[PDB]
């Protein structure tokens, strides 16, 4: 198979998006406790790798350092990300997934052919001409473009545009997938979800008994539960013990994940999982401060490969992750009840990549 090198590159990139995700989640939760955090570290990485096609010198170097894209040649980096995107991008009965990367550039600028072709060929990234002299009109244009492209999955991506912006990066991902075994919707019931040790809220809770990969981590005081999707993707639920969420967050690592896998076994489990409709919106300028990346957002003369204008920078960059978790699917000595704050990892096994990383403090909250 001629796709061997692309798969190896992707496998290495996947390990690095896991590290990125845990670093981002740790920082986001430290600065914003008691809040849901829902993002795609993979989608975020595709955006800045795509920008590496048009970035030079210090800006290029700092992205590659911050995102850890330095371990392989640039050709392999782009080929690896192309493989991940192409493999995951589907509109089938079992999986609906798209990674969107749209660069909105001021109509007065001239986006260069080579960058345009590479962005489209390697990432399916598109550059759209925008009139930034009318910020209100530019915002409604951007939001309508993305709502239409995503078929109403990614809405209101932009809430504000700063004056002087000539280049806006929009990164967005949506997910719909069928479970390997569907939940019976008639068995789904409104159950208690403990926001705090005393405070509760009624949430639609899905129920099913069957064979599931399950384990317990003594080192991080947490239960691990894997629920497979029909395609080679798994939903990993990490349920900390009472008052161990902060400890679990603090201990998250790449070695953590590979150790959790050594603690799992196939067992008959009665499972209780909340239904979800998660969205997460991030200002990537503030988010990327956590991994020391900022030159891409400053004027440095490093983006001439995109458009020749001297003062060019990425003015604004936004990430939006969207997911639905319900009963849809194909066709006890242990019980795992997800009725308190938990971590959710959507993991692609075939790559293997972290598609989504979520801290769910409230399944029906923002």
Curated annotation (Swiss-Prot):
Covalent S-S links between cysteines: none
InterPro entries the record matches: Serpin_dom, Serpin_fam, Serpin_sf, Serpin_sf_1, Serpin_sf_2
Effect of residue 330 to R: Fails to inhibit KLK7 activity. Increased protein stability in cleaved form and conformational changes which may allow escape of the substrate
Subcellular location, record wording: Secreted
Temperature impact on function: Highly thermostable, with a Tm value of 70 degrees Celsius. Incubation at 60 degrees Celsius for two hours has no apparent effect on KLK7 inhibition activity. Polymerization is observed at 70 degrees Celsius and above.
Similarity comment: family membership: Belongs to the serpin family.
Function: Adipokine that modulates insulin action by specifically inhibiting its target protease KLK7 in white adipose tissues.
Name this polypeptide is given: Serpin A12
Gene source species: Homo sapiens (Human)
């Amino acid at each position: 198979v001629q796709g061997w090198k692309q798969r190896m590159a992707a496998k290495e990139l996947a390990r690095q998006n896991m590290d990125l995700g845990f670093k981002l989640l740790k920082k986001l939760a430290f600065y914003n406790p008691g809040r849901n955090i829902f993002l795609s570290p993979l989608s975020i990485s595709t955006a800045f790798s795509m920008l590496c096609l048009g970035a030079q010198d210090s800006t290029l170097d700092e992205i590659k350092q911050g995102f850890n894209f330095r371990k392989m040649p640039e050709k392999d980096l782009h080929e690896g990300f192309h493989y991940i995107i192409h493999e995951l991008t589907q509109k089938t009965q079992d999986l609906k997934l798209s990674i969107g990367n749209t660069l909105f550039i001021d109509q007065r600028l001239q986006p260069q052919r080579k960058f345009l072709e590479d962005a489209k060929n390697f990432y399916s990234a598109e550059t759209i001409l925008t009139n930034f002299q009318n910020l209100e009109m530019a915002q409604k244009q951007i939001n309508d473009f993305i709502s239409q492209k995503t078929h109403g999955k990614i809405n209101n991506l932009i809430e504000n545009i700063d004056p002087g912006t000539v280049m806006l990066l929009a990164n967005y991902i949506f997910f719909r997938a069928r479970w390997k075994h569907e939940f019976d919707p008639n068995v789904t019931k409104e159950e208690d979800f403990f926001l705090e040790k005393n405070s509760s809220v009624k949430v639609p809770m899905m129920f099913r008994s069957g064979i599931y990969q399950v384990g317990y981590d003594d080192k991080l005081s947490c239960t691990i539960l894997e629920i497979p999707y029909q395609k080679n993707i798994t939903a990993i639920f990490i349920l900390p013990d009472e008052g161990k969420l902060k400890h679990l967050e603090k201990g998250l690592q790449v070695d953590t994940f590979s150790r959790w896998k050594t603690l799992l076994s196939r067992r008959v489990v009665c499972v209780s999982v909340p239904r979800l409709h998660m969205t997460g919106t991030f200002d990537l300028k503030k988010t990327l401060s956590y991994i020391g990346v900022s030159k891409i957002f400053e004027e440095h003369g490093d983006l001439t490969k995109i458009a020749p204008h001297r003062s060019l920078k990425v003015g604004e960059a936004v990430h939006k992750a969207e997911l639905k978790m319900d009963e849809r699917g194909t066709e006890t000595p242990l019980c795992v009840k997800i009725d308190k704050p938990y971590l959710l990892l959507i993991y692609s096994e075939k790559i293997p990549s972290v598609l989504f990383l979520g801290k769910i403090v409230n399944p029906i909250g923002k």
